[PDB]
Amino acid sequence: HGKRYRALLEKVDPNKIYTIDEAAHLVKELATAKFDETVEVHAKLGIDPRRSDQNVRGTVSLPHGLGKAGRIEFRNDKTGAIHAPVGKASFPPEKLADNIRAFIRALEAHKPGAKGTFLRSVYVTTTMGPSVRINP
Amino acid sequence: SKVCEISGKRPIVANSIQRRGKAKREGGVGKKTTGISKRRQYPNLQKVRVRVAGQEITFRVAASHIPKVYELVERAKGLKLEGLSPKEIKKELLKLL
Amino acid sequence: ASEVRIKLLLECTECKRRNYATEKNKRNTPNKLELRKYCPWCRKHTVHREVKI
Amino acid sequence: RNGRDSQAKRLGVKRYEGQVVRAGNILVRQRGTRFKPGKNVGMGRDFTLFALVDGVVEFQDRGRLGRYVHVRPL
RNA sequence: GGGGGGAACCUGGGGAACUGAAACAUCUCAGUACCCAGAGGAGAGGAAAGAGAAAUCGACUCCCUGAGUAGCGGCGAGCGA
RNA sequence: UGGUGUUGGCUCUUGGUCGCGCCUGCGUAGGAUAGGUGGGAGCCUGUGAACCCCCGCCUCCGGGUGGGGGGGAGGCGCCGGUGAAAUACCACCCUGGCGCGGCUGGGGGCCUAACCCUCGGAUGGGGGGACAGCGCUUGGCGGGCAGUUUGACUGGGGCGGU
RNA sequence: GGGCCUGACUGCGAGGCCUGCAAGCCGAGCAGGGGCGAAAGCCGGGCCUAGUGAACCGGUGGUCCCGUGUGGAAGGGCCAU
RNA sequence: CGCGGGGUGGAGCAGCCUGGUAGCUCGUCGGGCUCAUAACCCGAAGGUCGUCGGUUCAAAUCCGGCCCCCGCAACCA
RNA sequence: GCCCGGAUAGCUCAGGGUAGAGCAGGGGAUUGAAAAUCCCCGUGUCCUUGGUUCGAUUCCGAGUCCGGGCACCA
Numbered sequence: 053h054g055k056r057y058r059a060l061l062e063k064v065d066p067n068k069i070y071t072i073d074e075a076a077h078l079v080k081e082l083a084t085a086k087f088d089e090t091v092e093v094h095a096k097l098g099i100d101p102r103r104s105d106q107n108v109r110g111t112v113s114l115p116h117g118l119g120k121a122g123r124i125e126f127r128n129d130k131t132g133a134i135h136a137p138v139g140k141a142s143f144p145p146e147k148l149a150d151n152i153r154a155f156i157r158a159l160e161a162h163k164p165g166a167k168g169t170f171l172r173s174v175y176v177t178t179t180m181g182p183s184v185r186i187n188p
Numbered sequence: 189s190k191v192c193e194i195s196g197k198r199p200i201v202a203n204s205i206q207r208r209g210k211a212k213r214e215g216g217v218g219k220k221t222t223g224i225s226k227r228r229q230y231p232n233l234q235k236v237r238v239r240v241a242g243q244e245i246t247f248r249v250a251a252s253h254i255p256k257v258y259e260l261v262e263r264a265k266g267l268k269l270e271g272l273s274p275k276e277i278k279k280e281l282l283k284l285l
Numbered sequence: 286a287s288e289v290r291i292k293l294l295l296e297c298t299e300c301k302r303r304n305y306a307t308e309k310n311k312r313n314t315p316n317k318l319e320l321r322k323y324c325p326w327c328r329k330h331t332v333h334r335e336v337k338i
Numbered sequence: 339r340n341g342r343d344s345q346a347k348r349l350g351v352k353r354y355e356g357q358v359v360r361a362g363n364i365l366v367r368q369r370g371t372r373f374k375p376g377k378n379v380g381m382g383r384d385f386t387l388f389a390l391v392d393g394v395v396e397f398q399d400r401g402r403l404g405r406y407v408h409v410r411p412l
Numbered sequence: 413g414g415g416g417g418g419a420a421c422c423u424g425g426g427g428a429a430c431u432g433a434a435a436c437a438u439c440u441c442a443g444u445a446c447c448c449a450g451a452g453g454a455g456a457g458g459a460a461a462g463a464g465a466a467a468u469c470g471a472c473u474c475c476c477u478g479a480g481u482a483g484c485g486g487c488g489a490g491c492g493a
Numbered sequence: 494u495g496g497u498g499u500u501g502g503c504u505c506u507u508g509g510u511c512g513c514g515c516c517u518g519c520g521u522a523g524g525a526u527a528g529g530u531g532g533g534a535g536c537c538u539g540u541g542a543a544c545c546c547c548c549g550c551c552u553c554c555g556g557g558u559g560g561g562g563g564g565g566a567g568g569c570g571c572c573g574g575u576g577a578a579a580u581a582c583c584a585c586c587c588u589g590g591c592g593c594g595g596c597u598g599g600g601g602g603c604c605u606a607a608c609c610c611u612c613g614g615a616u617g618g619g620g621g622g623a624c625a626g627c628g629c630u631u632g633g634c635g636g637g638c639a640g641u642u643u644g645a646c647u648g649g650g651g652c653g654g655u
Numbered sequence: 656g657g658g659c660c661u662g663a664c665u666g667c668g669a670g671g672c673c674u675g676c677a678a679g680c681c682g683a684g685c686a687g688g689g690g691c692g693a694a695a696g697c698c699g700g701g702c703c704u705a706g707u708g709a710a711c712c713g714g715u716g717g718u719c720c721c722g723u724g725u726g727g728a729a730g731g732g733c734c735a736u
Numbered sequence: 737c738g739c740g741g742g743g744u745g746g747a748g749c750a751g752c753c754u755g756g757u758a759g760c761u762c763g764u765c766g767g768g769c770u771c772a773u774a775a776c777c778c779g780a781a782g783g784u785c786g787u788c789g790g791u792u793c794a795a796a797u798c799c800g801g802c803c804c805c806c807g808c809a810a811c812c813a
Numbered sequence: 814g815c816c817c818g819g820a821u822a823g824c825u826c827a828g829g830g831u832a833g834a835g836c837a838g839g840g841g842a843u844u845g846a847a848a849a850u851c852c853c854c855g856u857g858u859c860c861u862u863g864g865u866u867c868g869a870u871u872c873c874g875a876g877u878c879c880g881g882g883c884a885c886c887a
């Protein structure tokens with residue numbers, strides 16, 4: 053964990069719940085890589101992956117999109133985590149929170165059903181940057 | 189196995205109900221009662237020995253009302269005892285009740 | 286019915302209700318029954334898939 | 339070892355010639371086509387013969403073509 | 413001041429079984445019969461931490477009615493506000 | 494027989510299981526110890542880079558990995574090859590360890606003052622001792638005892654058979 | 656024997672067979688939405704008659720009918736099993 | 737007689753819930769070791785599964801008849 | 814029904830890569846009657862069915878049989 057990544061580790065209080073709005077704020081402040089990073093949105097899904105029935109595939113995106121339309125995918129791994137692009141190293145705020153908001157709405161559209169509150173643990177990060185907690 | 193000298197608690201009779209089966213709540217057929225016989229439920233009588241007016245005095249009391257014994261001793265620290273026999277100190281403490 | 290000839294339900298794949306009960310031999314036919322069947326809630330024919338009775 | 343038997347099944351024809359029958363009246367109870375269905379007679383999944391119209395029952399022997407029960411409307 | 417007695421009636425503490433269920437165990441008989449304590453010319457109960465849908469009634473007790481209703485029930489026999 | 498009440502004063506010793514630290518994950522191919530997806534074209538290094546003393550931790554049987562010293566410009570990754578899958582780096586996690594702290598347990602030891610026993614002597618001495626006894630509650634054994642069930646047909650009933 | 660299929664239908668049922676009860680059997684034809692056929696038509700499983708089990712209690716999926724002052728909920732009803 | 741079990745190379749036993757396959761030990765026979773016999777070692781033969789019938793494409797196997805063997809029962813008089 | 818074992822070669826058994834251990838039975842070295850011992854065999858419905866995998870004896874859904882304990886049976 054070299055010198056750079058700590059600077060960003062000064063910028064994220066570990067004991068805090070952030071907002072769909074707060075995310076778009078801090079994210080353009082953990083992208084201190086030397087390239088226009090992608091913003092990654094993660095979640096720990098509340099289902100069994102071994103269960104053939106309960107499962108997450110599907111396609112979104114909109115509004116803005118991949119920017120590499122902008123249709124993205126999301127499939128859970130064998131562990132129950134989902135995560136996906138997009139979002140980029142600006143991409144202004146209040147223009148990414150909208151993007152980040154609608155991805156959470158899907159998958160929140162695909163509870164197989166399963167057991168509990170779907171979006172158990174949720175997270176938002178950048179490519180070479182720390183994580184932020186956020187609130188679906 | 190008798191009557192609380194403070195509270196009046198005495199043995200009561202109760203049924204002992206033996207049941208088989210799975211509760212409906214748990215998705216069972218229901219509960220069936222495989223025997224009802226009579227039994228007695230007893231106060232948790234114990235002995236509290238206590239020194240009042242330099243005299244050893246024992247109450248046979250239910251555990252629940254044990255604190256009430258040293259309470260009457262607290263109220264009795266104000267009446268003419270000495271030199272009553274233990275039986276009559278007992279009567280006088282009980283009157284404070 | 287038996288261990289191998291089972292009882293089972295047909296569930297309209299569109300509205301997910303069970304409209305038919307029937308049997309099958311799960312050795313001769315180890316795959317969920319998919320048939321077409323009048324669904325009286327949908328009031329049209331629908332593919333029903335096999336569901337555990 | 340023995341001692342068994344099954345219930346009598348009360349077979350046979352239930353309306354003879356000249357009898358007036360309402361429609362779905364049963365005409366013959368049978369196993370197989372001892373009697374074949376004729377004019378105005380249907381045959382159920384168990385070879386039961388029944389009148390398909392109000393009428394008068396009539397029997398016909400057609401040789402190797404079998405015996406036939408008909409209903410003639412009135 | 414108490415003690416002991418009193419036909420039945422009364423309240424409290426205890427509390428069956430035959431029987432019914434055409435067997436029987438839950439259930440029934442029945443909180444009955446009986447034992448015990450206590451009270452009296454009666455006893456109990458009694459001035460809402462009530463009822464329960466009327467924005468309602470108004471301590472208790474007793475009769476009629478509500479009603480064999482609502483319900484309870486090996487949802488059986490029955491039991492029963 | 495577990496919990497708990499009566500039921501108190503000290504004390505040693507352990508084991509589980511949750512939470513953040515950390516590592517850990519190896520068929521054969523492959524540079525070789527590849528956990529799973531997703532981001533990813535850059536990433537570390539003057540806050541000390543490639544190696545190969547010391548340890549600690551592990552290891553599949555090649556090595557991996559953390560802390561410490563040595564040093565004195567470099568390492569990676571992309572590319573590309575084999576690949577079912579690709580290597581940096583980052584994120585969310587899965588498996589199983591490891592310390593630190595929740596919590597919850599079992600195996601002790603002493604003490605005296607409730608309880609218990611006992612001493613021609615008793616507001617006391619001595620002995621047991623928070624056990625035992627006793628209350629509520631849990632499961633177990635339980636013809637010692639209690640209530641009952643233990644079918645019908647039938648060339649009598651039983652046995653047989655139905 | 657082959658092609659295409661799922662009528663091994665849903666909502667009904669004149670009429671009868673059988674019959675102590677209860678059960679058990681057959682059923683033309685009407686509607687919905689289908690299959691096969693050029694069509695007539697046939698199809699509510701199998702050439703037929705064995706391959707089975709009333710209630711009660713409870714499980715599951717529906718339904719959204721009841722919901723102990725009201726809105727919910729608990730729990731129940733109804734349909735399917 | 738009733739109930740239960742059984743009959744398979746020469747002997748004593750598997751196999752048959754379970755249809756398509758007959759196996760173990762000893763014995764027998766041919767060969768070796770030994771001076772010779774046994775023990776031991778190598779190799780082989782021998783069963784149509786009590787018998788008749790049925791079911792089946794196929795019967796040791798499943799079903800029935802008949803024969804025989806074993807165990808149990810036959811009580812209130 | 815709930816939990817824990819079991820079902821992998823001819824016997825008895827070990828275990829996301831896969832099929833190995835001791836014996837059974839075959840070989841070959843020991844130079845030998847024998848055992849013992851070393852190298853070498855390899856026979857595997859991994860109890861079914863479906864599913865996730867590059868790959869399933871292994872993991873997940875549904876089943877079957879056997880043992881221990883518990884519970885339930887209109």
Ligand SMILES: [Mg+2]
Binds near residue numbers: 204205
């Ligand atoms: Mg009880």
Ligand SMILES: [Mg+2]
Binds near residue numbers: 218219
């Ligand atoms: Mg009950």
Ligand SMILES: [Mg+2]
Binds near residue numbers: 234235
């Ligand atoms: Mg005490």
Ligand SMILES: [Mg+2]
Binds near residue numbers: 252
């Ligand atoms: Mg208490």
Ligand SMILES: [Mg+2]
Binds near residue numbers: 339340654
């Ligand atoms: Mg007979």
Ligand SMILES: [Mg+2]
Binds near residue numbers: 343344345346
């Ligand atoms: Mg008859």
Ligand SMILES: [Mg+2]
Binds near residue numbers: 343345346
């Ligand atoms: Mg007959």
Ligand SMILES: [Mg+2]
Binds near residue numbers: 382383
């Ligand atoms: Mg028909």
Ligand SMILES: [Mg+2]
Binds near residue numbers: 355397398
């Ligand atoms: Mg004529």
Ligand SMILES: [Mg+2]
């Ligand atoms: Mg008594």
Ligand SMILES: [Mg+2]
Binds near residue numbers: 432433
């Ligand atoms: Mg009776």
Ligand SMILES: [Mg+2]
Binds near residue numbers: 435
């Ligand atoms: Mg009797």
Ligand SMILES: [Mg+2]
């Ligand atoms: Mg009784």
Ligand SMILES: [Mg+2]
């Ligand atoms: Mg009384």
Ligand SMILES: [Mg+2]
């Ligand atoms: Mg009375």
Ligand SMILES: [Mg+2]
């Ligand atoms: Mg008196």
